[PDB]
Amino acid sequence: QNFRVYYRDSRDPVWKGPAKLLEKGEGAVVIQDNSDIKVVPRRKAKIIRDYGK
């Protein structure tokens, strides 16, 4: 049902998120974190759904 995206940015090893999933491509995910739209390589993003709800 619903997805949130957690991701890593510019060198920063801290995970960021939740961000809104805008679009999923083969190599990148487009997300919105608060007020910034970001294009994130798939390998640096985890798209997590609210499985237990």
The residues binding ligand U5L (CB under 6 A) are 6, 15, 46, 48
Q: Is 47 in the site for a copy of itself (CB under 8 A)?
A: yes
The rounded distance, in Å, linking the Cα atoms of 16 and 45 is 9
Residue 23's binding partner among Cl ion, a copy of itself, ligand U5L, none (Cβ under 5 to 8 angstroms by kind) is: none
Among 26, 36, 51, 52, contact with Cl ion (rule: CB under 5 A) = 26
The rounded distance, in Å, linking the Cα atoms of 10 and 16 is 11
Contact predicate 46/34, CB 8 Å: no
Q: Is 44 helix (H, G, I), strand (E, B) or coil?
A: helix
Residue 13's binding partner among a copy of itself, ligand U5L, Cl ion, none (Cβ under 5 to 8 angstroms by kind) is: none
